[PDB]
Design a protein around this ligand. Structure first.
Ligand SMILES: [Ca+2]
Length: 193
């Protein structure tokens, strides 16, 4: 399936770069997957005083039965990197909600390793309940700041990311778990550590 929406003003793709810091005002190789349920503009915006890739999402009130159908699914294609000695992939994730009070966002990480069937998914999905947000302090520019980490030794389906396993693509999915979220999302400093 290809999810298709007319393009509008959006940031240039640039070239795949890790760490991805967006400081050149390009997407540094990040783009929607063809199957991403969100196909709206990807722009570089300031978040917490640094350039970040960003998009808006208003999830449907009627939730699809497939829990990724409505999800932003963004991917770094053809980076062809390896984790090396790094145990984690981590990034800054920011929310600027216009609505957020119930259910949760679940953030998943996957990769496309040509040695492992072009898919390997981190076991450690990260759940962000939206009722938790009210009690978090916002950045000065009014964002909720998360630093999300994935232990790359915990992968599904018995697949193993060796130090030298080539990772052709990296994918991040922000799934709506019965939430009322609407607003802006941002990623920055996507890196291994
Ligand atoms: Ca940045």
């Amino acid at each position: 399936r290809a999810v298709v929406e007319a393009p509008v003003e959006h940031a240039p793709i640039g070239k795949a770069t890790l760490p991805s810091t967006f400081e050149d005002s390009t997407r540094q190789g990040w783009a929607w997957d063809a199957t991403s349920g969100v196909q709206s503009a990807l722009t570089i915006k300031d978040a917490n005083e640094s350039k970040a890739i960003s998009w808006e999402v208003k999830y449907p009130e009627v939730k699809p039965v497939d829990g990724w159908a409505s999800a932003p699914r963004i991917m770094l294609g053809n980076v062809n990197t390896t984790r090396g000695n790094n145990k984690y992939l981590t990034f800054d994730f920011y929310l600027k909600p216009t609505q957020a009070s119930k259910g949760s966002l679940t953030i998943s990480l996957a990769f496309a390793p040509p040695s492992l069937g072009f898919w390997a998914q981190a076991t450690g999905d990260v759940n962000i309940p939206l009722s938790s947000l009210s009690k978090m302090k916002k950045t000065t520019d009014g964002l909720y700041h998360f630093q999300v980490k994935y232990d790359l030794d915990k992968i599904n389906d018995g697949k193993v990311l060796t130090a030298n396993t080539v990772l052709r693509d990296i994918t991040i999915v922000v799934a709506d778990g019965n939430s009322d979220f609407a607003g802006t999302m941002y990623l920055d400093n996507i890196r291994f550590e």
